[PDB]
Design a protein around this ligand. Structure first.
Ligand SMILES: Cc1cc2nc3c(=O)[nH]c(=O)nc-3n(C[C@H](O)[C@H](O)[C@H](O)COP(=O)(O)O)c2cc1C
Ligand SMILES: Cc1cc2nc3c(=O)[nH]c(=O)nc-3n(C[C@H](O)[C@H](O)[C@H](O)COP(=O)(O)O)c2cc1C
Ligand SMILES: Oc1ccc(O)cc1
Ligand SMILES: Oc1ccc(O)cc1
Lengths: 178, 178
């Protein structure tokens, strides 16, 4: 086990990967945008809070501040090319609203093909270093029945995993319940 | 796609799983404790910030408040049972420090057998509903060389994945860079 003192940004900050990327959908007037966020996480069960950490550099950043509502959608391995594409181009240069999607009960756009998605109302934004954490309260839930097991989890092997710097994967079929 | 409006806590809050659990290691004098946390995420690259979301119900919670420094260690599928064990018992009733570990440069405890670990200095704590987010600055990094690839990512198939409610998995060894 090699070790070193941190002296600035790490030569790679990928030790806690892979993670599932959340597709953040935001609408301001007629303009819709999508942005994968691999820095995401549950923050509370009661009430249900979910967090995404978005750089001020993203076009999505300014949209979320304005809209104060967004979606977070979770997508099968099969949609990795679409997910990658949405994370390698900016709403500033291309209209991501053309990606097939529907609007939710609260009118946040949700990218199609998702096994599950949340609609969120923005509760708080906190700056931590060079990204902002958007804390959302889950106000509605979407699920694709025959892609989710009983307790709410996606069928093993289904989840798109992200390893960092453009590399994707998926979980194995084999699960262990000790 | 079935939907419903959230009416309180979700029947299951697992739609965004699986994730890598971070084993949080903390020391207050002689007392060492370890707690897995699947609610974890990078928060900034410059400077490198890493967050874990810990319930005030955990013995680990008061230990973090006191010590203000912790480790987040990341473990191979191999150690699923030690991880589960540490996640099913409380330091209130069993001395978790008897699990094989070493102290790091800053004197935080790190659980042995990890492919990587961070040593963190606590910067802020934020209450989001029923959990507190502990934001740590990475002050040191440990890596078991060669178990990571060249960019810092753990070799495919190695990561312990958690699906929630005592179910674990691992990534498939097939990756795609689209
Ligand atoms: C798999 C993946 C995960 C990503 N996760 C994040 C993240 O957590 N935070 C972030 O600020 N950017 C993240 N990005 C980068 C943004 O998605 C990317 O900059 C995107 O093109 C932003 O689009 P926008 O400018 O339309 O918002 C990610 C990109 C990819 C491909
Ligand atoms: C895989 C796994 C992930 C967990 N993630 C979290 C988490 O993110 N936050 C939390 O408060 N508890 C989490 N727990 C529960 C604690 O790890 C568990 O309550 C543990 O016994 C705490 O022990 P302590 O009382 O010694 O702190 C998790 C448990 C498991 C098994
Ligand atoms: O802002 C980003 C955070 C994490 C990533 O993996 C990519 C971009
Ligand atoms: O406090 C907890 C958060 C998430 C989990 O999956 C388990 C415990």
């Amino acid at each position: 086990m090699r070790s070193y003192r941190a002296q600035g940004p790490l030569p790679g900050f990928y030790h806690y990967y892979p993670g599932v990327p959340a597709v953040v959908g935001v609408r301001v007037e007629e303009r819709v945008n999508f942005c994968p966020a691999v820095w995401n996480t549950g923050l509370s069960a009661d009430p249900p809070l979910f967090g995404v950490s978005i750089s001020p550099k993203r076009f999505t950043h300014g949209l979320l501040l304005k809209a104060r509502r967004f979606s977070a959608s979770f997508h099968p391995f099969g949609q990795k090319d679409l997910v990658h594409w949405l994370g390698s181009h900016s709403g500033r240069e291309v209209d991501k609203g053309q990606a097939p999607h529907f609007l939710g009960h609260t009118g946040v756009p949700i990218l199609e093909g998702a096994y599950a998605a949340y609609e969120l109302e923005l509760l708080e934004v906190h700056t931590f270093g060079d990204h902002d954490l958007f804390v959302g309260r889950v106000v509605a839930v979407w699920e694709e029945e025959g892609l989710l097991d009983e307790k709410g989890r996606p069928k093993p092997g289904l989840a798109l995993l992200y390893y960092g710097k453009g590399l994707y994967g998926r979980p194995a079929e084999e699960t262990f319940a000790p």
